[PDB]
Amino acid sequence: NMKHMAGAAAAGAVVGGLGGYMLGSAMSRPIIHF
Amino acid sequence: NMKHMAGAAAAGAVVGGLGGYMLGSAMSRPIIHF
Amino acid sequence: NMKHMAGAAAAGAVVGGLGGYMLGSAMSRPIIHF
Amino acid sequence: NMKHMAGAAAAGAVVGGLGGYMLGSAMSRPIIHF
Amino acid sequence: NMKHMAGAAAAGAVVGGLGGYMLGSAMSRPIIHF
Amino acid sequence: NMKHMAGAAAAGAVVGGLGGYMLGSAMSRPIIHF
Amino acid sequence: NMKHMAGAAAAGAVVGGLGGYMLGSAMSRPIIHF
Amino acid sequence: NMKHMAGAAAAGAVVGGLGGYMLGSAMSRPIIHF
Amino acid sequence: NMKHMAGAAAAGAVVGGLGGYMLGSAMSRPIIHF
Amino acid sequence: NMKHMAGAAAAGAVVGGLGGYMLGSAMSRPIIHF
Amino acid sequence: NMKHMAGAAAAGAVVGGLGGYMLGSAMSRPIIHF
Amino acid sequence: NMKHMAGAAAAGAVVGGLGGYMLGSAMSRPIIHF
Amino acid sequence: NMKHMAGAAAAGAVVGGLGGYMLGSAMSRPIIHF
Amino acid sequence: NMKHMAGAAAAGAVVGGLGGYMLGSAMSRPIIHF
Amino acid sequence: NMKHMAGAAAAGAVVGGLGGYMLGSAMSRPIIHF
Amino acid sequence: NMKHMAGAAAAGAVVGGLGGYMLGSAMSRPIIHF
Amino acid sequence: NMKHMAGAAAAGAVVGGLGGYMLGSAMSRPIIHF
Amino acid sequence: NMKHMAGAAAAGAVVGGLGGYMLGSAMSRPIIHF
Amino acid sequence: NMKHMAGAAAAGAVVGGLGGYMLGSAMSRPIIHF
Amino acid sequence: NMKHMAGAAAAGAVVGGLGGYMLGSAMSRPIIHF
């Protein structure tokens, strides 16, 4: 059997974001002019 | 069998966002002018 | 069988947002002028 | 002056949670028995 | 002066939760038995 | 003056959580028995 | 003046969490028994 | 059997983001003009 | 003046977490028994 | 059997990001003009 | 076991106040004009 | 075992206040005009 | 074992205040005009 | 004339005791045996 | 004239005791045996 | 005239004790045996 | 074993404040105009 | 005239004790046997 | 074993403050105009 | 006129004690036997 503990489980203060889950692609073409 | 504990379960203070779940793609074309 | 505990279950203070669930795509074309 | 753009402003699909804002402390004593 | 844009303003689809605002503390003592 | 762009602003698909903001402390004493 | 671009701004797909902001301390005493 | 503990489980203060999970590709063509 | 670009700005797919920001200390006394 | 402990488990203050998990490729063609 | 003696126990004349116990935060914005 | 004696225990005349116990934060913005 | 004696225990006249105990942060922005 | 402001006046959260006022003496002969 | 501001006036969180006021003497003869 | 500001006035978090005021003498003869 | 004696224990007249205990951070931005 | 600012006024976090005020003498004859 | 004697233990007249204990950081930006 | 700023005024974190004020003498005859 399996006993799995992951993420931020039982943490003390989860003040950062947690990871998402993306099943698909990213096409990115930003254009930045300073 | 499986015993799974994940996310921010049993946390102390989940002040950051949690991860979403996206099943699909992202096409992104931002244009930033400072 | 499965025993699953996730999200912010049993948390202490869930002051951040929780993750949504999006089954579909995002087309994004913002234009920012400072 | 200040021009500030933050958070998930102008995003394309904000499917994850956003960050909260906690002004105070977290005392956490979870006990997990698998 | 200040021009501030934050949160999920002008977003495309805010399907995740947004962050709350907690001014106070969290004492948490969950007990999980699988 | 200041022109600031941060967070996940103008992103394409923010499927992970964003960072919270915690002004206070975390005392954490989890006890895990597998 | 200042032109600052940080975080995951203008990213293509921010599927990991973003960093929080903690102004305070962490006292941690986990006890793990496998 | 397996006893697995990962992520930021049982942490003291998870103020950085956690890792997402991307099953798909990234095509990126940013153009930056200072 | 200053033109600063940092973090995972303009990235292609930010699937790892980003760095938080902790202004305070960490006292840690974990006890692990395999 | 296996007893595995990894990531930033039982850490004291995880203020850096954690590693994501990417199953797919990266094609990158940035163009930077200072 | 523990034998604890604290506060003003067994004192001779407790004419000052004793300490309270506040589990939560204080936001204070007094304005004093002499 | 532990034998602990603290506070103003067994004192002779506790005419000053004793220390409280605050588990949470203080945000303070006084404005004094003489 | 431990024999601990602290605070103003067994003192003769505790006319000053005793120390509190704050588990959390202080943000302070006073403005004084003489 | 006199304008006097003292004590914990206008405070934000007075969780410690305040000082008493003792006009008289203290004779103290505690005997502590651990 | 006089404008006096003292004590913990206008403070943000007075979690320590405040000073008393003793007009008289202290004779102290504790005897501690560990 | 006089404008006086002292003590822990306008402080951010007064978690230590404040000073008392003793107008009289202290005769002290402790005897400590470890 | 340990025999510890600290603070102002067994003192003769503790007319100054005692030290507090702060587990968290201080951000301070006073502005003083004489 | 006089504008005086002293003590821990306008401080950020006064976690140490403040000074008392003793107008009188101290006769001290401790006897310590280790 | 250990026999420890510290602080202002067994003192004759502790009219100065005692040291606090701060586990966390201080960010300070005072601005003084005479 | 006089503009005086002293003590730990406007400090960032006053975790040490502050100085008292003793107007009188100290006669001290400790006897230490190790």
PDB file of N, CA and C in Angstrom, chain F residues 25-27, chain Q residues 23-25:
ATOM      1  N   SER F  25       3.713  35.555  12.771  1.00  0.00           N
ATOM      2  CA  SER F  25       4.625  34.440  12.891  1.00  0.00           C
ATOM      3  C   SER F  25       3.901  33.115  12.792  1.00  0.00           C
ATOM      4  N   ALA F  26       4.699  32.067  12.629  1.00  0.00           N
ATOM      5  CA  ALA F  26       4.160  30.720  12.514  1.00  0.00           C
ATOM      6  C   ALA F  26       4.856  29.833  13.525  1.00  0.00           C
ATOM      7  N   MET F  27       4.075  29.265  14.436  1.00  0.00           N
ATOM      8  CA  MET F  27       4.630  28.238  15.298  1.00  0.00           C
ATOM      9  C   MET F  27       3.999  26.915  14.911  1.00  0.00           C
TER      10      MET F  27
ATOM     11  N   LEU Q  23       8.711  36.728  19.113  1.00  0.00           N
ATOM     12  CA  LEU Q  23       9.031  35.746  18.099  1.00  0.00           C
ATOM     13  C   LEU Q  23       8.382  36.233  16.822  1.00  0.00           C
ATOM     14  N   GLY Q  24       9.054  37.136  16.143  1.00  0.00           N
ATOM     15  CA  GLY Q  24       8.496  37.764  14.972  1.00  0.00           C
ATOM     16  C   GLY Q  24       9.217  39.058  14.737  1.00  0.00           C
ATOM     17  N   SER Q  25       8.807  39.773  13.710  1.00  0.00           N
ATOM     18  CA  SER Q  25       9.668  40.822  13.209  1.00  0.00           C
ATOM     19  C   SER Q  25       9.097  42.195  13.497  1.00  0.00           C
TER      20      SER Q  25
END
